[PDB]
């Protein structure tokens, strides 16, 4: 009975989802996946499946889990220094101290796990979120799960 609720992996479809997720968890993991036309559904689901597995592995940390598409939240990318080294990219935000760390290993189960493990041990490099405030978040329709158009 005395177990915390299941993880949730939420697409960043509006500011309330993003800000509440980061304010209600000590750390929030933000994945910026490639545009759907780069991966299609199969490639996007490969990345989402990695996030879902690690969210379960780390469920006792009670972290938040967010994902978005390249270019869909440009101001968020800028505030996290994302966009210049391609996609996928990952940041972990500490909302309380308004700081973040970027994944520097592979966007894979092994690479993200090493990233998260360092964070669970609280021994990784951080930087202030750009401007010292939570970035503006734009409203987006949720991904329909298909391969995009074009």
Residue numbers in the entry: 270 to 419
Text of the article:
Here we report the discovery of a multichaperone condensate in the ER lumen, which is formed around the chaperone PDIA6 during protein folding homeostasis. PDIA6 consists of two catalytically active thioredoxin-like domains, domains a0 and a, which are followed by the inactive domain b of unknown function. The PDIA6 condensates recruit further chaperones—Hsp70 BiP, J-domain protein ERdj3, disulfide isomerase PDIA1 and Hsp90 Grp94—which constitute some of the essential components of the early folding machinery.
The dimeric domain a0 is connected to domain a by a long positively charged linker, and domains a and b are connected by a short five-residue linker that presumably restricts the relative domain motions as it contains three conserved proline residues. Domains a and b unfold cooperatively, suggesting that they are stabilized by interdomain interactions. Titration of the paramagnetic analogue Gd3+, however, quenched NMR signals specifically in three structural regions, thus revealing three cation binding sites (I, II and III). Binding sites I and II are located at the domain a–b interface and in domain b, respectively. Taken together, the Ca2+-dependent phase separation of PDIA6 is controlled by a molecular switch in domain b, which is activated following Ca2+ binding. The data thus suggest a functional model for PDIA6 condensate formation, where the positively charged a0–a linker dynamically interacts with the negatively charged surface in domain b at homeostatic Ca2+ concentrations. PDIA6 interacts via its domain b with the nucleotide binding domain (NBD) of BiP.
